[PDB]
Amino acid sequence: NSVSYYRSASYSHVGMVRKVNEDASLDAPEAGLWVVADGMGGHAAGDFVSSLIVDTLRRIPAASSLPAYVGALRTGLAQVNERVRQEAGLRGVSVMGSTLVLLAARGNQASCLWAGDSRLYRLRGGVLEAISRDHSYVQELLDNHHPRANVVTRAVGVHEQLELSEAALHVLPGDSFLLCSDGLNKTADDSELRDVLSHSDPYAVVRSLVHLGLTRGAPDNITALVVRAF
Ligand SMILES: [Mn+2]
Ligand SMILES: [Mn+2]
């Protein structure tokens, strides 16, 4: 019952309103690493931060021990946070940051690190389950389609100390995972995500998710990254 192999695919689209894609992704199954980052601040700001995230995380050496790897990912994100803070302060801009959601896998164990309203879902036995929980003003109100949905309470470059949320996962053969920016779940509810994810091919699945989003007016940059365990 141990997990042998991870298949993955990613697809992003600027959408139907924005003309600059500030979404970024890293599809590195060769390092057991999958990342989606939703940049904010417009061109030369949001995409700057999201691309810096994916490039910094890509260069981290793939340590065999998942907990050590996760420690290294955390440190890399802290360094990205500090660099973005320095740059934003220098330019004097109000908005310069990016959400993050990553999944790192080693055999039968995986870890999710996230900050923002980019999500990780797990599909197991045809049942979809939200692993991450939005760092959003709305989510805090719900924990106690809302107009306060544009307020992200944690993301890279927002605060001095970046506080990442973490969730550990036991992976079974046949498990599926979806990393996405809010542009997808904003245009398809969780039951439709479960429907589209219930297919064998991650490449067709991510393209079908983005297509459904585009079909419903794609108000935001829409990115989907699907991982399947064997
Ligand atoms: Mn964005
Ligand atoms: Mn977004």
How far is the centre of ligand 1, averaged over its atoms, from the C-alpha of 1 (Å)?
39
H or E element that contains 159: none
How far is the centre of ligand 2, averaged over its atoms, from the C-alpha of 185 (Å)?
10
Q: How many CB atoms lie within 10 A of CB 221?
A: 25
Residues that constitute the known binding site for Mn(2+): 38-39, 182, 220
Resolution of the structure in the document, Å = 2.1
> What 3-state class would DSSP assign to 104?
strand
Ligand that comes closest to the CA of residue 22 = 1
Ligand that comes closest to the CA of residue 98 = 1
How far is the centre of ligand 1, averaged over its atoms, from the C-alpha of 23 (Å)?
6
Residues that constitute the known binding site: 38-39, 182, 220
- For the chain, the domains span 1-230
What ranges in the chain are assigned the alpha helix state H?
46-59, 66-91, 137-142, 182-185, 190-197, 202-215
Measured CA to CA, the distance from residue 56 to residue 69 in angstroms comes to: 14
Instruction: Provide the greatest CA pair distance for the chain.
Output: 54
CATH of range 1-230; options 3.30.530.20, 1.25.40.340, 3.40.50.2300, 3.60.40.10: 3.60.40.10
